Amino acid sequence: MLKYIIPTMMLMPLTWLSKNSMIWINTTLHSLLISLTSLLLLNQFGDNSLNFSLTFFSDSLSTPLLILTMWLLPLMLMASQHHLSKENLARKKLFISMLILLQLFLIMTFTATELIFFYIMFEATLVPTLIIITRWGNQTERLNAGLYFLFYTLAGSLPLLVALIYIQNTMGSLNFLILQYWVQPMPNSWSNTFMWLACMMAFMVKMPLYGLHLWLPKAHVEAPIAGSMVLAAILLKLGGYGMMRITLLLNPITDFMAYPFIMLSLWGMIMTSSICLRQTDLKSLIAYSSVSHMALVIVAILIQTPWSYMGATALMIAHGLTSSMLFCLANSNYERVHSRTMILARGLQTLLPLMAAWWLLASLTNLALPPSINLIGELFVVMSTFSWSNITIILMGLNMVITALYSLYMLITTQRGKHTHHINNILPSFTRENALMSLHMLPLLLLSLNPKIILGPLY
Amino acid sequence: ARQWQPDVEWAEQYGGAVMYPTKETAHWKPPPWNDVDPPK
Amino acid sequence: LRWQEDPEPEDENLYEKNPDSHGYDKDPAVDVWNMRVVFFFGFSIVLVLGSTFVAYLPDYRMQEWARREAERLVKYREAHGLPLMESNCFDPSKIQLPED
Amino acid sequence: DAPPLTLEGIKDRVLYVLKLYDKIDPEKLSVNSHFMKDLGLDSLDQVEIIMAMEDEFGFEIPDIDAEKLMCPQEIVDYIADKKDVYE
Amino acid sequence: SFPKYEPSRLASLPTTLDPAEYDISSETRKAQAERLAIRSRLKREYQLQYNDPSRRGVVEDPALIRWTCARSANVYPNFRPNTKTSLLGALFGIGPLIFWYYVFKTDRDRKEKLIQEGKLDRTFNISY
């Protein structure tokens, strides 16, 4: 994995030795080359993971997250170069450096063979993200957004450090390859109960769990667009990746300890989706939709059946692409009306027809339209939770009603109806913006032709 | 439409002798700038 | 007049000083070359050659092999009277049970 | 479908309806004939005239606009302004 | 004589059936005149900006910004924990969680007892 870490590192001289006008072009070009190179991680086998070294490996779980991670960086650089056009050159290079450093931490968060190196990169992803949100955010509440984002995360993860060092001292190694073969059954005790909670609550925070989700609608709406894209697309999926690694060790206690965290998810995806029926802010609606979609991934990991893991990893990749596109579309309106209010600018299919087609496709992939990988992940989670308990289909099916009822409402409020009369700075769609929407949607649609590369280690 | 940066109302929250003024910590004026007091 | 301040600037339009703008930069040559870079290394290189790469993956996670091997093994045990699958994954002779 | 209206056509149809009304004599009617002062009608008759205009041209005049149309020329100008005639 | 119209929460009383409409008193007419004056003043303040050729952008509506700040940014500072909000927050927050907990727990205890007794038809179930 050292053929991906060193090009990402070499993007630091590439953004700091460039001309004052070429720093977006060079970083976009070479990060697109790194994203093209990311497809060599598809050397996956039906029995063995792709094990590079003592430090780095990549199974079929980490590989789609890595391809999505290395693909998201040129897209964040395309989204972020408009609102940072008046920016100082040094601060512009600092923003590009924080995105590069965040990519560098993510691509060896997902490949960390050993779990405390996973912890160090997993908690190292805070600091560039914190700096991006609290420095290049727009409003007053970006500082409170950074405080909530930092102190839910570290409150969840500082027990995780102690739990991982306990596993290091007890088992002898936090190598995930050794812990596949030295895993012992975790019995029923209070020590093992708080062992389970210390292993899980960090990822429950970063997914987010319902009830712990309160950092997210502050951290998504107060971030800039590259921050919103990286929290939606990747930084929620650190929790899912970490759960799918750490629930190996947490058996058979999970089979009676996951009950409060499934209910909180199965009712919470009803609540947050319901919140999306009444959100006046468009970016907050996309944030609460992200909570609603990651609650299904929480249920699918906690029931730990194979169909559930396959649906959860397909749902993570699909939701990453879809929610990143939704934040980019909301940014496309915010760069024209300079307010995130969803009822402000209406009727925008008369004014931006092709951008309304991109809104339509992103709204259809939000509501899980088949055969998209959104519906593949949604459907497989619903199948495995029907296997879990037959009554859950109620809480599933009702959610699939409400997920439609805000996916099209967002389509009808922003793009349909009579347009706002007193708004006249509605420019035609830039080629940068349509390129950004197409680079989100066209991989999301091509992955319907071959979904087997985004279905985890147990396809 | 531009980026919010703090004003005088935000920045004067950090100018007191303490950060969270209570009833006891209310008469505390901030210390002098060169830390040199009048000889009284 | 509290906290002396630059007035907030007007929203600048990239189409006014450049009606052929692609939205990348206020310099039109930089704008057109950033458009060409994004479209060539985004669509002509990652999407097209990436879809061609994923379409021709060398038997991704051995799922073709596992069919073909199965087409051997069924053909081995249809002909020899054996059942197509045993309920035991391992040989019951090589397992010591705890006595009771 | 829907042939375009002209000012002369709207004026001829408005006067054509008002000549088919048994309280307005057709020999006295003009485009500037006020209904209450120059024709001696009632406000109920004016409501019925605006309803005949609505049945004639197939669209509703709201009451706040209907109670201000007191001659055939005001009716023709209202239907002109709404149907956007003489493009 | 006639069945009196009973207005409801989602079927309001008409304007033409309200007895407070047919009062022509000057103290209720001054209120209507003052409301019309406020509406005319806000209308003029709007369309002196809406018809400006120099303006190219969004006419800022302080009522819309004020509405969004009331709906989002001014909910917790106007909260007081009392008997009403506590008996609503517990009955709506942990209530359905306890309900679905006992529902899914009873269902899975029933299904687990049927499976480990062999009394559940699980013949062709090999996808899970």
Added chain:
Amino acid sequence: SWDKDVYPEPPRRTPAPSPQTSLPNPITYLTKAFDLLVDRPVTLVREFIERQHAKNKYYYYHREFRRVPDITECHEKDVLCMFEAEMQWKRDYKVDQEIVNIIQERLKACQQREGESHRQNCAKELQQFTQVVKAYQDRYHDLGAHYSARKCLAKQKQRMLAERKATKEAA
């Protein structure tokens, strides 16, 4: 082509055309037109492509995995042997999955090719399907998403304890 024994088909018995009416049916003329207009140019193009295949003939092989020791003869917490046992078990798991898929293809193809008398004429495929699904369920079901050869051996030992207890209590 494929192997006719692992994918069995009964011999096709089509009836001879016995036309009673004097009206010529359109289907014979459309079959002649499909043979003259479609089947012959596609056949010529495929013969050209087949000659171009025959000008350079090369081969691919079926990968043979030799049988390493399984998990029962691996020492506890000895990763160099139980790694090989686990990889062997995962490959055999994929193969057993595809055996179940082959028998499902047999069952569905029998149901379609028999049509309306499929409930009588597909009892053998239904019996083979029931056998292989019972074997797959006793072998790999309820293991979980972190399935391993240790989990499968523990399930087998639990089932064999149940079998031995049922043998003891009924003797």
Added chain:
Amino acid sequence: AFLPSAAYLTHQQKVLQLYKRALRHLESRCVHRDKYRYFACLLRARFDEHKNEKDMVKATQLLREAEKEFWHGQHPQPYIFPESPGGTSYERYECYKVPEWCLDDWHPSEKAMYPDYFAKREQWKKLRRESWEREVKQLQEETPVGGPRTEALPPARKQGDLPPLWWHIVTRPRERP
């Protein structure tokens, strides 16, 4: 209670609006034109029975029980004109009513496709921006203290001035673009 120019509906306006609602709901009740014309003359006779009632309290009482009569005798599906609100063709064409400022966002290649139209548009925009300050100083010298009382705009009082706040009334979209 709600009008753009006045702050209230008069008694005469309430009686006339009840008369028109009663005739339209009667035409919705009784479909054929001869039978409608019979019952419409009967309804006109019922309104002309109490036309010269000088007592305003008695006339308001008659209006109130006539509203009760109407509300009992209305139609569940009244006839609505198609472009009238509630009709089937109402606000149908609003997705084709593109505002005129979008013509400022066109490319010069697609502005050159209509040379005379944009050359004639620029004199409308010149007329607007050379009349704007005159009509603003017309409004601010005519509006009394405390802002305007009513929503009525004054006309142009001079020769050469345009009426104040005229652009989005004149340059509004057509009904059928």
